[PDB]
Amino acid sequence: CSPPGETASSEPGTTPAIWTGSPSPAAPSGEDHGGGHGAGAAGAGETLTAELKT
Amino acid sequence: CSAGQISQTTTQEPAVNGVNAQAGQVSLRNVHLRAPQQTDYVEPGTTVELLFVAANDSTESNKLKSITSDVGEVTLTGDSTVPADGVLIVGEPDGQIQAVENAEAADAVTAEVELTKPITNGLLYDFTFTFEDGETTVAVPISAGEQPRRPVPPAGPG
Amino acid sequence: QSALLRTGKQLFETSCVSCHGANLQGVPDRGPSLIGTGEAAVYFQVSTGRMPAMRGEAQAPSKPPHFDESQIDALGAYVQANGGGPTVPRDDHGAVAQESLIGGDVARGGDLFRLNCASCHNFTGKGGALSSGKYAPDLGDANPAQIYTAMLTGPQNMPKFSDRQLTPDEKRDIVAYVRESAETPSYGGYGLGGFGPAPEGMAMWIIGMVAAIGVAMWIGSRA
Ligand SMILES: CC(C)=CCC/C(C)=C/CC/C(C)=C/CC/C(C)=C/CC/C(C)=C/CC/C(C)=C/CC/C(C)=C/CC/C(C)=C/CC/C(C)=C/CC1=C(C)C(=O)c2ccccc2C1=O
Ligand SMILES: CCCCCCCCCCCCCCCC(=O)O[C@H](COC(=O)CCCCCCC[C@@H](C)CCCCCCCCC)COP(=O)(O)O[C@H]1[C@H](O)[C@H](O)[C@H](O)[C@@H](O)[C@@H]1O
Ligand code: HEC
Ligand code: HEC
Ligand SMILES: CCCCCCCCCCCCCCCC(=O)OC[C@H](C)OC(=O)CCCCCCCC[C@@H](C)CCCCCCCC
Ligand SMILES: *C(=O)CCCCCCCCCCCCCCC
């Protein structure tokens, strides 16, 4: 005997798409904190940058 | 009888990243792309260089190298009709030595491509090299010539 | 260098143009093109002697080198100029580096060797067999530059370990482990080659068992 599933010459295939990993659900819910702050508004956190251009 | 007409040693491609395209009178060797990528893709609009060596097989010559352009608009700066029983070295693969203080025809036929399409290392991208004798698709790879590892960020256990 | 390039060309033209055609392009079905192989490939291959090759077979065997260090450098420079590629390491003076390639860490080198090298060579760099007439040779003859360049350019049926895949520090550690395992004396007696079960069983059956049987024949009486 030989393995039932082999030798699919047809269907050349396609290049895999860029992987976009989903965030870890409640199972591995652990994630890095984005920054603690008072946040007396809708929420900004302790991380905010900006680029002053010309 | 590993020495018969089909022997392992003889039927071996060079251990180089560039592909070989023997189709046509002029043979293309070590044809690759120097496209240093800082992320998943080399974004369109950035110029990456096209390395290869065109060796002439016949002395009777095929020194035209008309267009050799594909998706990306490959342009041949300092183009010259070099191949006459010899080599046309378009660029300087990493580790290349100039071999003399001066130079001939300024750059030695440097081929550069404005991508107009994302590319990434590990993929094969078709290039149609067309000499007056004929045209051949080569399926050039992306090669990181001599650049060492780019430092990946340290991992924070979670 | 100009004269180095000229010497490399002269050696090439009267050594290998029959199988690595002039212009460094490969002769179809006799030898691969040397464009892009680099100086490291030439150094390793010619210094080990494999390249003055007088047969097409399963594997090109090692042999005494046909060129001295200066001619090896000339050929390597010629091939590097023609194709452009990996370069053999060198020390401060300019000679091919031997001691500088001995990595400081040997445990790391051994781990990397086992993960990557022992796969086919051995636990300690003795030889190994391959599919059809091929074989991974013993590493005890190779010098640090030869080991480093062997990794840098996969010679034949050997994976090509780029600097990105094995940073030169990792390759230096592997070189240190190879040299240490090769030059280290067998603790516990004569290591019968480096393969445990087979040489050990043969030595049992030939040394211990013939001794026991001969002593039994001496003590007892034939009948
Ligand atoms: C599955 C299977 C057995 C396939 C065939 C493989 C096999 C055993 C082939 C034969 C090996 C030989 C004899 C190769 C030489 C070339 C050859 C075939 C010549 C013709 C043979 C012939 C008819 C010759 C005329 C008379 C004759 C029969 C001479 C035989 C010569 C020999 C080699 C005799 C002794 C037998 C022998 C040593 C066989 C190899 C087997 C083993 C397991 C050796 C173990 C061993 C090894 C492998 C070490 O590396 C080592 C390193 C350091 C210390 C110790 C050892 C050690 O003990
Ligand atoms: C009867 C009881 C007595 C038992 C024998 C005890 C002998 C004690 C010897 C002295 C103490 C131990 C020395 C240990 C130092 C040591 O190990 O010894 C090597 C040598 O080794 C060799 O070559 C072998 C040389 C030949 C002499 C020994 C042959 C004895 C065999 C025949 C005994 C088994 C019986 C088998 C019967 C076979 C017939 C079957 C039908 C020498 O170095 P080297 O040679 O360079 O080893 C290479 C590394 O360098 C290099 O990297 C590495 O890559 C390797 O290439 C390595 O070989
Ligand atoms: C089977 C896959 C393979 C692996 C993986 C491999 N080798 Fe090799 N090695 C070979 C083969 C086959 C040769 C013979 C090449 C030739 O003769 O052209 C060789 C040649 C060598 C040589 C030349 C020895 C001499 O005396 O000529 C050395 C040294 C070496 N390898 C060490 C290493 C090192 C260091 C690594 C790093 C992990 C490694 N090997 C990984 C198969 C492998
Ligand atoms: C057919 C006889 C033969 C001759 C003679 C010969 N080569 Fe080769 N060459 C080969 C073969 C076959 C290979 C690939 C298989 C191998 O190396 O075992 C090769 C591969 C090479 C490689 C390694 C290519 C790679 O991708 O790693 C180098 C370097 C090289 N040759 C240079 C030379 C130089 C320099 C000479 C002359 C000093 C020479 N060769 C003489 C046949 C030959
Ligand atoms: C039935 C058992 C008896 C045999 C019956 C009649 C046996 C009659 C045997 C016809 C054999 C025909 C072969 C046809 C070759 C082929 O088309 O394939 C090519 C292959 C690719 O080429 C090879 O790879 C090697 C081919 C050479 C074989 C060397 C063998 C040398 C033997 C020595 C090692 C000595 C051994 C001791 C042997 C000792 C015996 C001495 C006679
Ligand atoms: C490669 O491994 C070997 C190549 C040899 C091919 C030619 C063989 C010629 C025939 C030899 C005869 C052997 C003895 C026959 C016994 C009956």
Closest among C92, C179, C186 to C144, alpha carbons compared: C179
| Nearest chain C residue to B100, by CA | C2
Q: Give the separation between CA B144 and CA B150, rounded to whole angstroms.
A: 11
Task: Give me the torsion for CA of C149, C154, C158, C164, rounded to 10°.
Answer: 90
State the DSSP code for C26: P
- How much is the CA Rg of chain A, to the nearest whole Å? 24
* Three-state secondary structure call for residue C146: helix
Chain B meets chain C (3+ C-beta pairs below 8 A): yes
The token pair at C180 is: 């240490």
Q: How far is A36 from chain B (nearest CA, A)?
A: 18
| Nearest chain B residue to A18, by CA | B40
Closest among B107, B108, B127, B109 to B117, alpha carbons compared: B127
What are B28's strand-pairing partners? Answer: B21, B54
Q: Give the separation between CA B156 and CA B35, rounded to whole angstroms.
A: 30
CB-CB neighbors (< 8 A) of A23 in chain B: none
Which of A14, A15, A29, A31 to mutate to test binding with chain B, by most B CBs within 10 Å of its CB? Answer: A15
The token pair at C52 is: 């003055």
The token pair at C23 is: 């212009």
Do B35 and C87 form a contact (C-beta atoms < 8 A)? no
**Considering CB atoms only, which of C25, C56, C168 is closest to B55?**
C25
Q: Give the separation between CA C188 and CA C185, rounded to whole angstroms.
A: 9
Backbone CA torsion sign across C112, C113, C116, C119: negative
What are C122's strand-pairing partners? Answer: none
CB-CB neighbors (< 8 A) of A31 in chain B: 158
Contact A31 B158 (CB under 8 A): yes
The token pair at B59 is: 């002395």
Chain A meets chain C (3+ C-beta pairs below 8 A): no
Helix or strand run (H / E) with residue C6: helix C2-13
Q: Give the separation between CA C143 and CA C120, rounded to whole angstroms.
A: 19
Look at strands B74-77 and B110-114 and give their pairing: antiparallel
Q: Give the separation between CA C130 and CA B65, rounded to whole angstroms.
A: 43
Q: Does B156 touch chain A (CB under 8 A)?
A: yes
Q: How many CB atoms lie within 10 A of CB C89?
A: 21
- The resolution in angstroms reads 3.0
Ligand nearest C133 Cα, by number?
A: 6
Q: Does A20 touch chain B (CB under 8 A)?
A: no
The token pair at B70 is: 């594909």
Residue labelled with tokens 């009178």: B25
Q: Is residue B15 lining ligand 6, measured as CB closer than 6 Å?
A: no
Alpha helices in B10-158 (DSSP H): none
Q: Can you spell out the DSSP letters for B117-139?
A: S-B-TT--B--EEE-SS-EEE--
